[PDB]
CSV table of C-alpha atoms in Angstrom, one decimal:
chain,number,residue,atom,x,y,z
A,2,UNK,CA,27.5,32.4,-13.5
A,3,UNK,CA,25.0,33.2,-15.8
A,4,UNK,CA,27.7,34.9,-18.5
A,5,UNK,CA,31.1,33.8,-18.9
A,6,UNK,CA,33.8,35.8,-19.8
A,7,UNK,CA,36.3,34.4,-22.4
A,8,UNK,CA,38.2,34.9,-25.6
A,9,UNK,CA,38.3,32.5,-28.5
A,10,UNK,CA,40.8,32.0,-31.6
A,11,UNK,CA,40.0,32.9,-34.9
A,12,UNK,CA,40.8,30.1,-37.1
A,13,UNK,CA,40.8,30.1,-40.9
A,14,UNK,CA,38.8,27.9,-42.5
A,15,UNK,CA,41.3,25.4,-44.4
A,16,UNK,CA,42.9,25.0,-41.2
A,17,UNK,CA,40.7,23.5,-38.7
A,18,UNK,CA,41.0,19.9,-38.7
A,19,UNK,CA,37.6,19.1,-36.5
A,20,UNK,CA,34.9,21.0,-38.6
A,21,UNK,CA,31.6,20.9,-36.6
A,22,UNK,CA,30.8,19.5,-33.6
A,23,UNK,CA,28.3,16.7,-34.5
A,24,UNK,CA,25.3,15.3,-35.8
A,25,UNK,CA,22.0,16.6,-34.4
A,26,UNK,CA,21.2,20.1,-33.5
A,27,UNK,CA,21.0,18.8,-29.8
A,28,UNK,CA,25.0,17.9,-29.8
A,29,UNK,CA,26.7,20.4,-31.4
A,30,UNK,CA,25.1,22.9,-28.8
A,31,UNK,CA,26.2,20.6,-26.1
A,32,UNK,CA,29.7,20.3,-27.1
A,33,UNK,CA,29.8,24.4,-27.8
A,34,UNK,CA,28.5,24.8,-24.7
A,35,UNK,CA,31.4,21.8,-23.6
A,36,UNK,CA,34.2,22.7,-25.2
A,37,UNK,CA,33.6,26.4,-24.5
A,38,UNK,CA,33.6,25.5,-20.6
A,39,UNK,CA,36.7,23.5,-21.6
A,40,UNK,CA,38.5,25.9,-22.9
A,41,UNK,CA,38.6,24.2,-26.6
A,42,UNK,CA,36.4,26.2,-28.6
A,43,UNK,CA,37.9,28.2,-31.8
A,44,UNK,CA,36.1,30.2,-34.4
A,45,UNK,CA,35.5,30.4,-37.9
A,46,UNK,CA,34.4,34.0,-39.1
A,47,UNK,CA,31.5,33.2,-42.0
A,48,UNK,CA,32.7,34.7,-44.9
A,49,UNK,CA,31.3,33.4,-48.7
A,50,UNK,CA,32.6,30.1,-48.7
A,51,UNK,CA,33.0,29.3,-45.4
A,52,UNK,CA,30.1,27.4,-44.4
A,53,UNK,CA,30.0,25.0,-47.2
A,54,UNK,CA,33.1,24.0,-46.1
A,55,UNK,CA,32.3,23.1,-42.5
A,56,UNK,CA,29.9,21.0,-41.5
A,57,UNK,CA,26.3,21.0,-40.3
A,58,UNK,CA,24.8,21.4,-38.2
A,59,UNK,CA,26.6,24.5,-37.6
A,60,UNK,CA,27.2,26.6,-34.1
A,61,UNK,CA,27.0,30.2,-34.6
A,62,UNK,CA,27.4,32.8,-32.0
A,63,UNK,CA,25.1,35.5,-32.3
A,64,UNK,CA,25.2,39.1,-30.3
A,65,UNK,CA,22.4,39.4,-27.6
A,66,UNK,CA,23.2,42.9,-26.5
A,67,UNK,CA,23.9,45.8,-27.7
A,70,UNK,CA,30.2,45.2,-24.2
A,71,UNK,CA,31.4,44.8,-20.9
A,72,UNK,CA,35.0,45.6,-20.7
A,73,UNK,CA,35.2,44.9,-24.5
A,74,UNK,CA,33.4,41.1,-25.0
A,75,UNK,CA,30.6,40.9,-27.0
A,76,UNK,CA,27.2,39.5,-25.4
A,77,UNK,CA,26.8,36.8,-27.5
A,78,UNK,CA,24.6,33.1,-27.6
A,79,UNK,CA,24.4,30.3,-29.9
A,80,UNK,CA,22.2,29.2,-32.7
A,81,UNK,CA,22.2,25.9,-34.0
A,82,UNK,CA,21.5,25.7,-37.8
A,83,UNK,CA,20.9,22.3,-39.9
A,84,UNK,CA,19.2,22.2,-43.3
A,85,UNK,CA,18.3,26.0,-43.5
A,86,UNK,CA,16.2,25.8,-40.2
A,87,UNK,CA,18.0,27.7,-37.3
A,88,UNK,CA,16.7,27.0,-33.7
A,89,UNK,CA,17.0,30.1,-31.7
A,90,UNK,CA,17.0,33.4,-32.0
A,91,UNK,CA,19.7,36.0,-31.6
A,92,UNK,CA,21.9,39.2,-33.4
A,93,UNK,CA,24.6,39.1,-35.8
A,94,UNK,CA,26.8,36.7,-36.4
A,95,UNK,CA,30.2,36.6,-35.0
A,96,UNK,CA,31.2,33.8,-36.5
A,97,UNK,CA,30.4,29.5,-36.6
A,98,UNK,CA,31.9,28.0,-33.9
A,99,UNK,CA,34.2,24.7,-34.5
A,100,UNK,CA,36.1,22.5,-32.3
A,101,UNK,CA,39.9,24.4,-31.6
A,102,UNK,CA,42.7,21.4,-31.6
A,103,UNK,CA,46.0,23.2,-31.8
A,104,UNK,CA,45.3,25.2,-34.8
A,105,UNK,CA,47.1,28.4,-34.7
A,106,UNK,CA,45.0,31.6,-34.2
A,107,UNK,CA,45.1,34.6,-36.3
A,108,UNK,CA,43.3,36.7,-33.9
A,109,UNK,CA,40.7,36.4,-30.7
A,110,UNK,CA,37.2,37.4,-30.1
A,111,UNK,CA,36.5,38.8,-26.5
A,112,UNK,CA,33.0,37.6,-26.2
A,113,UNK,CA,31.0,36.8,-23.5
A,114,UNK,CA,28.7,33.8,-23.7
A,115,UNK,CA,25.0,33.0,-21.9
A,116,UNK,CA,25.2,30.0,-20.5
């Protein structure tokens, strides 16, 4: 399907334990597109302070669209040294690696594969 339908944790920042989810731009959409198949993916919401303390390169999700039955259309956009590679809307948050932190809310998006 070309847009799945799921719902991710929001996890404060001081909590998740796995903080980015590698080391080129290449892999850490790989695994966000992995671990969001695999049902693993979390999210941080950016907020002043946030990114510093996760790590690049970073995994935003961005809105594409302008909300069926209440997930936002949303893609991702690698980011490492100030240079983003893609192009999308807002941010709804950086996307991290979810490993049995406890959520304080979820996200109803709905991601382009």
């Amino acid at each position: 399907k070309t847009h799945v339908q799921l719902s991710l944790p929001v996890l404060q920042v001081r909590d998740v334990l796995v903080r980015g989810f590698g080391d080129s731009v290449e892999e850490v959409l790989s695994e966000a597109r992995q671990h969001l198949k695999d049902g693993t993916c979390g999210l941080v919401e950016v907020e002043k302070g946030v990114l510093p303390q996760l790590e690049q390169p970073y995994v935003f999700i961005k809105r594409s669209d302008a909300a069926p039955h209440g997930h936002v259309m949303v893609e991702l956009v690698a980011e490492l040294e100030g240079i983003q590679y893609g192009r999308s809307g807002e941010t709804l948050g950086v996307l991290v690696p979810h490993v049995g932190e406890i959520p304080v809310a979820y996200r109803k998006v709905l991601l382009r594969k």
